[PDB]
Structure 1
Amino acid sequence: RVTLQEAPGTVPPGRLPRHREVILLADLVDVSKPGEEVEVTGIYKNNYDGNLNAKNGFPVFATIIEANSIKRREVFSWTEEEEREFRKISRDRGIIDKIISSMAPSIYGHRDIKTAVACSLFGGVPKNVNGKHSIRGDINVLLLGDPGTAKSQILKYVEKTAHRAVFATGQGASAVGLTASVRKDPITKEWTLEGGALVLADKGVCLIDEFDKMNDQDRTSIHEAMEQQSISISKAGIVTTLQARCSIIAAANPNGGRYNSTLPLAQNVSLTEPILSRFDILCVVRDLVDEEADERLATFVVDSHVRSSPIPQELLMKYIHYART
Structure 2
Amino acid sequence: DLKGHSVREWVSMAGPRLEIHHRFKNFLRTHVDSHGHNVFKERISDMCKENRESLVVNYEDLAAREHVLAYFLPEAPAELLQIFDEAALEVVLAMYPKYDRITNHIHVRISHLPLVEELRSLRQLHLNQLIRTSGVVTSCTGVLPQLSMVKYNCNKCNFVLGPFCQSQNQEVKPGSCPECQSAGPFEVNMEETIYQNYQRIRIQESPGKVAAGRLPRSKDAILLADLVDSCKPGDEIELTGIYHNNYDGSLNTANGFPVFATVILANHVAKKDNGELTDEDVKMITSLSKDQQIGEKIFASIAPSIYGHEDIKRGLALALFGGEPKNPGGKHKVRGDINVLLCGDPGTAKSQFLKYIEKVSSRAIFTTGQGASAVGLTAYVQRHPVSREWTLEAGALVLADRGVCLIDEFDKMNDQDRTSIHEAMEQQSISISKAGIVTSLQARCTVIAAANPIGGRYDPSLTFSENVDLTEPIISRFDILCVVRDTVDPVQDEMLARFVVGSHVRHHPSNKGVEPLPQEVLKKYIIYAKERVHPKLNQMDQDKVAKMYSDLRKESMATGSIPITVRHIESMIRMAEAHARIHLRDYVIEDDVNMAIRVMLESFIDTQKFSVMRSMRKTFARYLSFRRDNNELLLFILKQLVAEQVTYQRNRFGAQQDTIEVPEKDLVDKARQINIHNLSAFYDSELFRMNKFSHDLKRKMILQQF
TM-score strictly above 0.5:
yes
Report what 1:164 is aligned to: 363
Q: Which moved more, 1:307-316 or 1:58-67?
A: 58-67
Report what 2:21 is aligned to: none
Compute the displacement of 1:21 (Å).
1.8
Distance 1:49 1:76 in 2: 43
Compute the displacement of 1:249 (Å).
0.4
Structure 1 residues 253 and 52 mapped into 2: Cα distance closer, same or farther (>3 Å)? Answer: closer
C-alpha distance after superposition, 1:190-237 (max 9, x if no partner): 422221111111111100121232211111111111222222121221
1:95 aligns with 2:304: no
Q: Which AA in structure 2 matches 1:163?
A: S
Q: Is the 8 A contact 2:430 2:441 kept in 1?
A: yes
Structure holding more helix per residue = 2
Structure 1 residues 212 and 57 mapped into 2: Cα distance closer, same or farther (>3 Å)? Answer: closer
C-alpha distance after superposition, 1:221-258 (max 9, x if no partner): 11111222222121221221212211100101012241
Report what 2:410 is aligned to: 211
C-alpha distance after superposition, 1:9-49 (max 9, x if no partner): 12222222212221111110001111121101112221254
Structure 1 residues 45 and 284 mapped into 2: Cα distance closer, same or farther (>3 Å)? Answer: same
Q: SS of the residue aligned with 1:66?
A: strand
Report what 1:314 is aligned to: 523
Distance 2:253 2:486 in 1: 76
Q: Is the 8 A contact 1:122 1:324 kept in 2?
A: no
Compute the displacement of 1:119 (Å).
0.2
Structure 1 residues 52 and 306 mapped into 2: Cα distance closer, same or farther (>3 Å)? Answer: closer
Q: Which AA in structure 2 matches 1:290?
A: D
Compute the displacement of 1:112 (Å).
0.8
Compute the displacement of 1:317 (Å).
0.5
Compute the displacement of 1:58 (Å).
4.7
Q: Is the 8 A contact 2:354 2:408 kept in 1?
A: no
- Relative contact order, higher structure (CA 8 A, sep 6+): 1
Structure 1 residues 285 and 29 mapped into 2: Cα distance closer, same or farther (>3 Å)? Answer: same
TM-score (norm 2): 0.44
Report what 2:450 is aligned to: 251
Root mean square deviation of aligned Cα: 2.2
Structure 1 gaps of 5+ residues are none
Q: Which moved more, 1:67-76 or 1:28-37?
A: 67-76
Q: Is the 8 A contact 2:344 2:452 kept in 1?
A: yes
Compute the displacement of 1:164 (Å).
0.8
Report what 1:180 is aligned to: 379
Q: Matched residue pairs, number?
A: 324
Distance 1:34 1:42 in 2: 19
Structure holding more strand per residue = 2
Structure 1 residues 230 and 10 mapped into 2: Cα distance closer, same or farther (>3 Å)? Answer: closer
Distance 1:296 1:52 in 2: 64
Structure 1 residues 181 and 119 mapped into 2: Cα distance closer, same or farther (>3 Å)? Answer: same
**Which is greater in Rg?**
2
Q: SS of the residue aligned with 2:532?
A: helix
* Aligned pairs for 1:167-316 within 5 A: 167-260=366-459, 262-307=461-506, 308=508, 309-316=518-525
Distance 2:355 2:255 in 1: 54
Report what 1:112 is aligned to: 311
Compute the displacement of 1:131 (Å).
4.2
Distance 2:256 2:203 in 1: 28
Report what 2:278 is aligned to: 78
Residue of 128, 135, 139 corresponding to 2:327:
128
Compute the displacement of 1:57 (Å).
7.2
Distance 1:125 1:52 in 2: 62
State the identity as a percent.
Answer: 65
Q: SS of the residue aligned with 1:41?
A: strand
Distance 1:249 1:205 in 2: 7
TM-score (norm 1): 0.92
Report what 1:22 is aligned to: 221
Residue of 17, 38, 42 corresponding to 2:241:
42
Structure 2 gaps of 5+ residues are 1-199, 509-517, 535-706
Q: Is the 8 A contact 2:351 2:408 kept in 1?
A: no
Distance 1:108 1:218 in 2: 32
